[PDB]
Homo-oligomer: A and B are copies of this chain.
Amino acid sequence: SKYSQDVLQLLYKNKPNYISGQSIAESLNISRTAVKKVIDQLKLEGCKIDSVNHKGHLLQQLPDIWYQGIIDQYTKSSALFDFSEVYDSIDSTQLAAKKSLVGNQSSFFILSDEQTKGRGRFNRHWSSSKGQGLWMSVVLRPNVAFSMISKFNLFIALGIRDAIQHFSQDEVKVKWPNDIYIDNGKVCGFLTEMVANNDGIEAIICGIGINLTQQLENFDESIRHRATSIQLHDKNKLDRYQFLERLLQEIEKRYNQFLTLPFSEIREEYIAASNIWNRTLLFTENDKQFKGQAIDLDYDGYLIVRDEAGESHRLISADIDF
């Protein structure tokens, strides 16, 4: 109700310390027995809080639900982002981000527990089941030319990857240009779009879907061989909030690199992180489809491909299948 996030904010702010019902009640100028009432609900909503008499409450562990209130804490103390929007369900964070950026120069991100109408590249359906993954759009505001998009996409990839890795027992690879894998399962897909004109980019909108807490059971049967989740590669439970934290951390890192360094500078690294070498790839281009091999990513972000018929292409993007 009206005060839930508020209570939550305090519980989060105050860690690893207990706070009294009383104390909360005076912050939010409401009754002591209201606070007891707002707590019990959170607990029922799958919050783990320790209540100790004469001592008060301690927010121990959070459920697989995004709470605005907590997110605000991430936003408050952040160079990069002005604010955030958090939903339990929406059509698409990317759609919402696309609307929210109009007419303003803010930087912000959107998060939703479920997306009812999530879309990937080429307007593909992207499956965004409730409480199971991170579905986020990020808006940043680099002052640069529109051509510079592709570079963003490459830098940001390593960002996302590092974040995922740091929680994975196994090797986490990028599949240029838009996809992250753990061994054989796609664990994430992301996409970098812009509003821009000739004078430069007005905004970057970076959509990111990462499967967090799935069982193969939860994955569709017709894709269950090539999909995975972060949880399936961490012996420890996966705290979405801990993970969101590291995700923003590396986004920032890579965002700054994108601004201050040329692609040549991360190219090697990108390379070692990629999983497309030494195997045969099925490219699509509209009606046409063909196989070929990944020769090299050039100093400019372009992939050097040698098609099955021996011809070299230099490509800025492509959709590749294994």
Contacts and interface: CB of A to CB of B under 8 A. Distances in A.
Interface string A95-136: 100110011000000000000000001100000000000000
A91 interface: yes
B192 A198 contact: yes
A304 interface: no
A30 B149 CA distance: 56
A102 B99 contact: yes
B95 A199 contact: no
A93 interface: no
B193 A121 contact: no
A194 to B, nearest CB: 6
Oligomer copy total: 2
A202 interface: yes
Residue among A102, A121, A196, A197 with most chain B CB within 10 A = A197
A150 B198 CA distance: 7
User: Considering residues A99, A150, A195, which has the most beta carbons from chain B within 10 angstroms of its beta carbon?
Assistant: A195
Interface string A180-192: 0000000000011
B199 A196 contact: no
A213 interface: no
Q: Which 8 pairs between the two chains have the least Cβ-Cβ distance? A: A193-B197, A198-B317, A98-B102, A95-B103, A195-B195, A99-B102, A99-B99, A121-B199
Interface of A: 91-92, 95, 98-99, 102-103, 121-122, 146-147, 149-150, 153, 177, 191-199, 202, 316-317
